[PDB]
């Protein structure tokens, strides 16, 4: 509980469909982007943690909650964009007379800051009398021991929880999904999807002096104007598709039915024909 592991995985293909065919995970509450639409999503840095808690305490792994493990053992930020996976593990983490190999923190001075691991053992002094190596009224060991007995209902049974913390920021993606790739077509307004950034437009070889550490490029607004190809390391400009307004010149329905169309913003080459200002 207090020594939750963290094995950061990077530079690999993540197929989340494997987790569905495993043991029943009836806690897959993705407090984040999406539980289902997750394979077609590139990530930058995914941090996978692990810990074992009771049954009635799994609801405290949500971003923002009170309790004892969400304030002094393992607290998640309010902007946690990830998925928490838990399942009943009352088949190998329980034993006769209760398992005493899982200790949790009970007493602490202040609330645990987001993503902090407090590996320490000091007698919490709650008041005037300072203790040295004993425990009394104001002194006690802050690490209590869980009692995982195979006798109670599912309210206190051991639950193996694994939380996957995603970043999803403007950085070179390293953990994508099992989605395949296609061939790059530049001179055509098509639908592009580079590392999750969807959209449509014409891609052209830009003469922009992109630095080696820079991947994306934005204009005066927060819109991706240029993106570097993740495979061939080529910088391409993202110009929007051919749009514009349409005006109809109508002399009057009572007079006739002939109408003229005025394509605003076109030079008569991207729609008799007459070019105006």
């Amino acid at each position, epitope marked *: 509980v207090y020594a939750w592991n963290r094995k950061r995985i990077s530079n690999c293909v993540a197929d989340y469909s494997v987790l569905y065919n495993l043991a029943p995970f009836f806690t897959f509450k993705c407090y984040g982007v999406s539980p289902t639409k997750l394979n077609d999503l590139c990530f930058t840095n995914v941090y996978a943690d692990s810990f074992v808690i009771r049954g009635d305490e799994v609801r405290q792994i949500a971003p923002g909650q009170t309790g004892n493990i969400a304030d002094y053992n393992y607290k998640l930020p309010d902007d946690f964009t990830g998925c928490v996976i838990a399942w009943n593990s009352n*088949k*190998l*983490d329980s034993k*006769v007379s209760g398992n005493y190999n899982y200790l949790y923190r009970l007493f602490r001075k202040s609330n645990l800051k987001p993503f902090e691991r407090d590996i320490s053992t000091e007698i919490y002094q709650a008041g005037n009398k300072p203790c040295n190596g004993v425990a009394g009224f104001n002194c006690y060991f802050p690490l209590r021991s869980y009692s995982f007995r195979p*006798t109670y*209902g599912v309210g206190h049974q051991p639950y193996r929880v694994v939380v996957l913390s995603f970043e999803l920021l403007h950085a070179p993606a390293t953990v994508c999904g099992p989605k395949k790739s296609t061939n790059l077509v530049k001179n055509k307004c098509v639908n592009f999807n580079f590392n999750g950034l969807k959209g449509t437009g014409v891609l052209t070889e830009s003469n922009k002096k992109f630095l080696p550490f820079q991947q994306f490029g934005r204009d005066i607004a927060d819109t991706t104007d240029a993106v570097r190809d993740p495979q061939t390391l080529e910088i391409l400009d993202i110009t929007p598709c051919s749009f514009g307004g349409v005006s109809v010149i109508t002399p009057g329905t009572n007079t006739s039915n002939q109408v003229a169309v005025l394509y605003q913003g076109v030079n008569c080459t991207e729609v008799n024909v007459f070019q105006t200002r």
Partner: antibody
Amino acid sequence: QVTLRESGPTLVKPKQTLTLTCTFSGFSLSTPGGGVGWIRQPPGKALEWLALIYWDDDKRYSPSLKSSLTITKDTSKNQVVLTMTNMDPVDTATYYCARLTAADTIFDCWGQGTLVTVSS
Amino acid sequence: ALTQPASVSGSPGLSITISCTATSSDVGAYNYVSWYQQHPGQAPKLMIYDVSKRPSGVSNRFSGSKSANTASLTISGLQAEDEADYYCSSYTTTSVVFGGGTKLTVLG
């Protein structure tokens, strides 16, 4: 498959310490959730649990008998040894060592049994 | 502990049930309960554990359930090779109880 064979002297002097072993073959005791225990079966009576060991050196014993039951593991040679002191002429029974695969499967595979008749 | 009927009779072909009552159930929720079979002269082998499921190698003749606090073993299609002692075992707060015995006598 799992083969749980027992050994040790069946006949001994009263008021001594038994050395009933349990040579297990076909599985590794270091699996999470596994363990080997001991069940007593008096002649013409029901079963009764005596002791149980786990994969993390945890030694669980019966609450009635704790001053004599001392179990130990020898995974180096795959031979679980059970020792009990203060042998009285009431403990004559066929002992069995069964593997506890997990919490849901309570003693799925059993052994064959060794009768220990020691009164006088 | 756990109490079981002493003698249970059953005609060949019918179905009989066993009773694994509470008897001051310190077991708690009575989640896990396993039933064994011990022929005279052999070793007890597991027939059904976690009564909602059954182990591999056992025919569909054996099934079990637990309505509120009593586990029952439903054995359908009785045969001559079924007269053995059955035991229900659960996890108590400090030990592993094995209950009493139940002798099946298939007449006819």
